Amino acid sequence: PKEPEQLRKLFIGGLSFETTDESLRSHFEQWGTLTDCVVMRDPNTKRSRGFGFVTYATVEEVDAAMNARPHKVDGRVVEPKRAVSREDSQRPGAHLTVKKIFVGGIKEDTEEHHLRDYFEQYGKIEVIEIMTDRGSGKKRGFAFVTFDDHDSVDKIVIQKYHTVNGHNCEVRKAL
Template sequence: MGSRSGDRSSPQKIFIGGLHKDTTNTEFNSHFGKYGEITDSVIMRDRNTGLPRGFGFITFADPSVVDKVIEDTHIFNGKQVEIKRTIPKGAGGNQSKDFKTKKIFVGGIPSSVTEDELKEFFAKYGTIVEHQIIRDHQTNRSRGFGFVIFDSEEVVDELLSKGNMIDMADTKRLLYL
């Protein structure tokens, strides 16, 4: 009815980052299914290798469930994951103001991009306090996503007012709070 297929965000949708590579769809759905009815779920995989990229999305039937999920600590295979609300594309204006954060998630980072390059790219938007590309613990390879923390919430508001895709190294990036 009101939802469009393929939309990456809605009030009942969450981003889960830092998933252990061995997390199965069954474990994923079973864990989050305890909170309420799931209408959609996905663990993102590399298009070329089919290997998990370390993050995914869950959409609940009831948006009020999201608050409870975000309050709790979630551990998969001994590893704590990070839960964030998704932000609608082009959610500038009043909508993004509801999320007050200095931290963004950056997905789809090419393995060739270094942490210094990540910082340099986002420094043009504002002062960066912390930045990190998440790496595989055993191989130290980039897992294709990371986080940037700015010194002010206004920087994030301004960045998201332009939409949640930015071009970096000829590839589109998704930004989530």
């Protein structure tokens, strides 16, 4: 059972106009088997649009490619991004590239270390903010986690489930 193809794709932005299907593939095959690899071009001029896509055979290969950033492809540092659902987008077909998540449903007994221990395996955490009531100081049952990079957030929001401190949590991109 293969993971859905959408979860195995990387958009590669910022390409050199000299990058080709072949040179993009040669580069990105270092991190996995590529089932597809295309440079987007103008339909009339064939001039590169400056972005392309690669599709790996597995999600672990996507992760390996993302963990090997920064990627300098044909002399230019490119911008890889994995796909997320429309619910974590501001408009169809656009990526909301952010470093912060909202975590809801954690109630009053969840502490900073619960969030750190769980989320640190998705990326490097810079800020954990457990939200408390402005008047009483009581925990409100939600938090924000800020990472050093957007791929952590992208991996997080595409999971169907997050269980933190025994709670089934709602997690979404923030700001």
